Amino acid sequence: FAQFGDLKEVRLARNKKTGNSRHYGFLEFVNKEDAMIAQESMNNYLLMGHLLQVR
Amino acid sequence: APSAKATAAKKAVVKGTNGKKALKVRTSATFRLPKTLKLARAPKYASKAVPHYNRLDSYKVIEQPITSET
């Protein structure tokens, strides 16, 4: 997500017990417009058999 | 803002960045047929199945001599 603009700070959700992810996270790149274009791009994006949704 | 770095990435993921065509410039203001192949007559059968014997042999050419008084 550097590619969609300069990123401010990122953070995801890891378990505090046998630490592994609960499969979600958060981010703000800098901007509202950067956020919304990234959402428009990756709204229903695909890879193996999860698919990213974004808000 | 433009988010200029993103707009490259915008078209990147949905298309796959193969968006550059190449064009060959046609300096000539006109256009004619390209010199494509013109193949060779290699048949299955022959046209009349026999080489004709010589039609105009010498014994046919000279028909007679002449025995006259000039």
UniProtKB/Swiss-Prot annotation, chain A:
Phenotype on disruption? Essential gene. Abrupt growth arrest prior to substantial depletion of ribosomal subunits. Fails to synthesize the 25S and 5.8S rRNA components of the 60S ribosomal subunit, and exonucleolytic 5' processing of 5.8S rRNA is strongly inhibited. Arrests at cytokinesis and fails to assemble a contractile actin ring at the bud neck.
Which cysteines link up through disulfide bonds? Answer: none
Q: Subcellular location, in the record's words?
A: Cytoplasm; Nucleus, Nucleolus
| Superkingdom per UniProt | Eukaryota
Instruction: Tell me the ranges covered by the RRM domain, including all copies.
Output: 1-55
Main function: Involved in the biogenesis of the 60S ribosomal subunit. Required for pre-rRNA processing and cytokinesis. Associates with the precursors of the 25S and 5.8S rRNAs.
| Miscellaneous remark of the record | Present with 4280 molecules/cell in log phase SD medium.
Listed under subunit, the entry gives: Component of the pre-66S ribosomal particle. Interacts with NOP7 and RRP1.
Q: What is this protein called?
A: Ribosome biogenesis protein 15
User: Per the UniProt entry, what species is this protein from, by scientific name?
Assistant: Saccharomyces cerevisiae (strain ATCC 204508 / S288c)
Highest classification ranks of the organism: Eukaryota, Fungi, Dikarya, Ascomycota, Saccharomycotina
Question: Entire protein: which part is shown?
Answer: 111 to 165 of 220
From Swiss-Prot, chain B:
The cross-link described as Glycyl lysine isopeptide (Lys-Gly) (interchain with G-Cter in SUMO) comes at 60
> Subcellular localization, per the record?
Cytoplasm
The record describes the protein's role as: Component of the ribosome, a large ribonucleoprotein complex responsible for the synthesis of proteins in the cell. The small ribosomal subunit (SSU) binds messenger RNAs (mRNAs) and translates the encoded message by selecting cognate aminoacyl-transfer RNA (tRNA) molecules. The large subunit (LSU) contains the ribosomal catalytic site termed the peptidyl transferase center (PTC), which catalyzes the formation of peptide bonds, thereby polymerizing the amino acids delivered by tRNAs into a polypeptide chain.
- State the similarity comment: Belongs to the universal ribosomal protein uL23 family.
Q: How does it assemble?
A: Component of the large ribosomal subunit (LSU). Mature yeast ribosomes consist of a small (40S) and a large (60S) subunit. The 40S small subunit contains 1 molecule of ribosomal RNA (18S rRNA) and 33 different proteins (encoded by 57 genes). The large 60S subunit contains 3 rRNA molecules (25S, 5.8S and 5S rRNA) and 46 different proteins (encoded by 81 genes). uL23 is associated with the polypeptide exit tunnel.
State what protein this is by name.
Large ribosomal subunit protein uL23
